[PDB]
Design an enzyme around this catalytic site. Structure first.
Site: not given
Lengths: 442, 443, 444, 442
Positions: D178, D372, D415
């Site tokens: 993202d 990210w 994650e």
């Protein structure tokens, strides 16, 4: 019954150090009580998870026996050991071969160049270990890169004189599959002259005659020695005089793979650019040479009998040579993989394990106990599995590995196994079987 | 990450063991200990049992071939023609002075703990899993050597417990296996050497870091006790009168109790003479009680006893935990003792890299984090404790020691001992009983 | 070729099953056959859950203990609200209306089952000690919340089911033994003469349709007759002994209680529980170990059950003979003899057994039936229990061998309720929760 | 502290089953309380060792959300949940998108086509599990082959309108990365007009603002929503109005791989030749399109901003897109591998693991915690590791797998992880992190 993974890896390592004479590991305790060329590559693979320093010693010992023209002989004899025939006295390379090493006794014939694969494994292990361990492997490259080039160059220049990209053999022993049906029609044309008397030693150790080659086969193995001796193992004379001259497609595929492996090592470790160029050219040449032999329908590779000028058509594990080195068109590799997995080979309904029999159980040549005429060989299971992984066939390589280990779980480290019952055959405590187990686990 | 996987570690350990094999004996280490030692040989047999029952049996047959005629198993069986270790066969002079020494082995003059019955049990347990021809090998070893084992245990009981106190007397700190333990410092302080014939150490030629080995002063007293023994030709009946060092070793005694019981169950399973099993049970019980009689009222900690000073020896080492091995403490004292084991003086100390038992408490003034038995973590002790705890039925506590033992061993150094706080391997690398402990856990 | 799962595969599959049988705050013994919570399955489910989640393990026992009767009895089934497929269900036991001591807010059965719960608490506590401070706090919070509850469960067994203080537990239904159709109870059941028995339809043999794997109709008629008997006296503890047609002392249950008592006592010391409770637990531990030894054959050491109505020892050749091995107490010679019986050719050493495991009934007994529930098959729950008790006696290798073979047998991934002793065929319910629990604990 | 392999595998299956809502798995228990498209592929990979039947269910539920035009929407919302934004109401897809399915509720955008990879993994497990399990998977094929073809054909024809062999994205969310620095300069040219008010839910669950995108970025994300919404999600009208239009070279390579993997399946299970030919055509077109982005020295792949008409140079894990799909000349690929090892990535001195950070630690865009922009993601380690093995790089793929397990050995199934300290970040209990571990050990 079956050993756990840690038990098995322990018993294999225990076996490998037990076959170690000091600076060379015998290929088995009694049957092969010397250093053999392709076994020593596998022994280095098995030793590398135990001691990078000692795996390097194994390759340094074999290379110290390299012939002056670059040939790695298929035996390096242990000083003053008997038990095996033909021994140093029968080859007489010390007295007859101008290229034989001054300070090692060796045989007069060669064997497949699996050696670059052993160097790769050593380097990959060494890179996961210390800086001092990388220094040992890198120092080994500095010391022996030339010797490895001469080895590969001798194969390409002296055993592929016509640049056909297939290796010529002058003895079935150089193939590693002494009694394979691949060589039967070649051997039927070998007529011994005055064969000097001898007594076998191999079937003193392995006394079951169903498991070893026949006396008649041995008469032809030793006659070829006499032909070689007559010309003093002179490369430039063998083509004229040898009654056995075959292009070995399996050996050539191995050579193709090795040249690629060595070339990438040369790249990684800044070896001379001219060497890497030669290695890549040989890689491609022998890949193309393997493919040229292959069946139009199944992609199976053929051996070529140089004297008879005819393709050898048999149903053995060497038909899969092209899978090791690639190059088949996409459609024909699928055909070949289907032959591999189908009922003529890995899918035969009667096999205990999902493994490659040396000869197809449906061939008329098949013999469930007889050396290379049918038994399952762990060394081949490893080589196929490592090459498949290298083609990117991750699952196919994993299944070979998984059945290989399951077969290996009895702890006999047998030289080969009966395809249907799993009975261990050949020598027990066979070093390259223990190496395969150790590489898969270690 | 430097750590090996379990199959990598088990393979390197087996490769270690076969590499230390001279043929029919395994050295305790490549260079530091280039001969067969008595309790190392027991562990080597444990380590060999998952590799080859036949060769494990060979190791014990070799050691028992050096057993003295009165039954003593000496703590060293020297390799023929090997130097690099002092004191060597020439310093002991047992070949010429000991009427009971064997005519065809060179040996030392002192004993070591009787861990050997435990190795026999592991050999038998592996052999029962590996089929008929392998059980036969182990059973035939029992037929050949049951007598020798009995003589071994009867010499300890009759010759080193001549007052039937249930505690084994030592005449040298080396017989305890913890040469420089703080256990023996006050006893050694009363060892005044006479004219000691000169000598040069070999051990610290190989381990040159002085922080890792005993001092010259300690060695001076180790060799002097040899002289006292030599002047008297190692005669059991003279030692009490002349030896300057005479201590009751509670840890050896606890081991002997456990061994007697182990050997007695083996005797029952394998139909050895009933009178032998009775003797073994009697000694198990007597040495259990003798260990307990030494213990502290609050904590349960076991004490050594100085026979000459007539003094309980109060130190803070791992030998305090002897009663955990052999049982017999009242329920509430053993709880206190386990609390000592797990708390901050020992396994729960906050600076330890691993949950393992330091040879001396890191809170004791005697503690030294590098110096042999004065603090380091010893894999052989981890194994013994873990194996004994499992036998007590403390499955989880035996499991945790094993687990931390393997984590520590996962560098692959197979070190003789480790620094308790940093994990640095110390002593000889490639030590055979450390490799054995790894094999046993995973084999 | 090889249809076996690797250890990591089998462990993943076991945890996947265990989560799939979770209804939220209770785990079903099986997906369909046993679609409710069972008392000793719940203890094993908690054992299985401890390596995955000490919190959810603690929840499983909390839910079970919330079903505890007012007098301390842990009933053997806590019915899942509004779910069917099992008979006899809550409409048949009628316990909400007939037992003054049933829990107000839980539907449950009206009989009990062996007290393995303390073993489950030990396993929980051991895992939580390894996991860290927050997890140890959850497990300690459970002990503060449930210790009194556990004591009442043990004291109710000791006082209401060993009223003559003989060190053995009386059952009023074979179902309370956990081994419903064991040969052990055949002669006692032969004296159960049903009367007016309200008609009913079995649901268990609709799920398991093969009749060779389940009890007969005539056994179920006797099972449902005892229900009518105790229902007739409102499940009153004081009335049961004069009206029940089935009154047996269960030596296996008794040895389990002895073990449980010792285990819970030792937890009580470690976690500083009331001194009066620990002493009482040590008292019961000894009383029931002696009561188990009192049953045993002076030669072989084999433990017998007791028919209190017939006033006769029950000699049968089932796994229950080995009850003294779990709790201790036998003289040396008697225990060596017992071990010989266990590994000999009448049990683990029988030449035709696929695995070196304890069959529920001895293959050389005339009562042996290789498929029929407790009359022969190998039960992984018994293999775990024997293995864990064996290790606790200090029999490290003996316990290791059972675990090893237990994992070999389970490595098919069926997680079967029981296995055929000779062929290893999976039998009973597939996906049985406590078989998954055994594997998880052997590997988690 | 760290769990054994069996414990971690049991815990990964526990997590996976607990996130099962019945016929779909949530990407995470709370942060991602719905089904995501490439999480779902990874969930199917994680379920294959546990239940081929249930893994097939997972992809059926996903393909049941497949839009009429072929697009697989990147979110299939769970009926009833309201803890995530943007939800059903903000997408208005069930009323504005004429191709949105009936009775589902999905997003309006797509996500990378890792699905063929999940199909191959399912088929490989099924072939090892016996006849009935094979039938389950082959019946999934018959049921879903046309649907998979339609998903690939939509990407090739509708997201590669100029036949450039690269996928055009209209939302940064479609890359799965993202807030990658990759998109910053395209996002900087997105001017949000009248953005209806909204409240983020993502930072209610993950409170540390250092781990999640900023509010300014969410504004751009919800503004791109308004653009496609105002034009009813019509494929034909998106390029005229979307203010974010990028070619994603990582997505493009994944498509290349997927196409080749689905082609091979199609051959294996005798699907129509025309589909196989097309899949091989797309595999090569997108392999070529990925190679066309790369630096002629380093081999690093660039994304391309279609509006600005310029190459996007950033230093993210995406540079390594060509390693996944092949294609590069030998020297360029060697150069790119040295970039991947070596100090700017896996070889950085301060990394706790030998793993690929989502952003180079030496990039000025690096942030060790920020989604990210730096952290290490177990989903990328698995993807890289599996594609590497497919290239035949057995050891390289084994090192990532080894390191990826060592990092996951805490059992948090995070994650992403802080690259230097190993701290678990993002949502705990993340389904595709559990799936990665299960496949590596299942």
């Amino acid at each position: 019954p079956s050993f756990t993974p840690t038990q098995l890896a322990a018993r294999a390592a225990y076996l490998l150090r037990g076959n170690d004479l000091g600076t060379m590991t015998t290929a088995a305790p009694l049957l092969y009580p010397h250093m053999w060329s392709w076994d020593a590559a596998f022994v280095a693979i098995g030793l590398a998870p135990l001691s990078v320093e000692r795996a390097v010693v194994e390759l340094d010992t074999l290379l110290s026996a390299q012939w002056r023209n670059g040939m790695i002989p298929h035996i390096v004899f242990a000083n003053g050991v008997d038990g095996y025939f033909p021994g140093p006295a029968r080859w007489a390379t010390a007295t007859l071969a101008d290229n034989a090493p001054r300070n090692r006794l060796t045989s007069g014939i060669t064997q497949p160049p699996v050696h670059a694969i052993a160097v790769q494994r050593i380097l990959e292990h060494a890179r996961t270990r210390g800086r001092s361990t990388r220094a040992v492997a890198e120092a080994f490259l500095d010391r022996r890169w030339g010797d490895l080039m001469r080895w590969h160059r001798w194969l390409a220049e002296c055993r592929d004189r016509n640049e056909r990209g297939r290796i010529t053999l002058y003895h079935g022993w150089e193939s590693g599959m002494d009694n394979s049906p691949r060589w039967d029609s070649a051997y039927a044309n070998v007529v011994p002259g005055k064969l000097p008397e001898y007594q076998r030693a191999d079937n003193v150790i392995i006394t079951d005659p169903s498991q070893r080659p026949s006396d008649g086969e041995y008469d032809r193995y030793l006659w070829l020695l006499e032909e070689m001796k007559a010309v003093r193992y002179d490369d430039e004379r063998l083509p004229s005089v040898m009654s056995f001259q075959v292009e070995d497609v399996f050996f050539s595929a191995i050579f193709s793979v090795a040249c690629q492996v060595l070339a990438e090592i040369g790249e990684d470790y800044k070896r001379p650019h001219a060497d890497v160029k030669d290695l890549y050219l040989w890689a491609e040449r022998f890949r193309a040479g393997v493919v040229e032999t292959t069946d139009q329908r199944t992609g199976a590779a053929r051996d070529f009998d140089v004297l008879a000028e005819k393709w050898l058509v048999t149903e053995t594990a060497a038909q899969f040579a092209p899978l090791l080195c690639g190059g088949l068109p996409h459609d024909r590799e699928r055909a070949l993989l289907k032959l591999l997995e189908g009922p003529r080979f890995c899918g035969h309904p009667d096999l205990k394990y999902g493994l490659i029999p040396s000869t197809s159980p449906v061939s008329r040549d098949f013999r469930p106990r007889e050396y290379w005429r049918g038994p399952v060989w762990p060394v081949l299971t490893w080589l196929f599995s490592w090459c498949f992984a290298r083609r990117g066939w991750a699952e196919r390589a994993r299944l070979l590995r998984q059945e290989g280990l399951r077969q290996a779980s009895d702890g006999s480290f047998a030289e080969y196994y009966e395809p249907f019952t799993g009975e261990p055959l050949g020598s027990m405590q066979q070093s390259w079987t223990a190496a395969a187990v150790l590489d898969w686990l270690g």
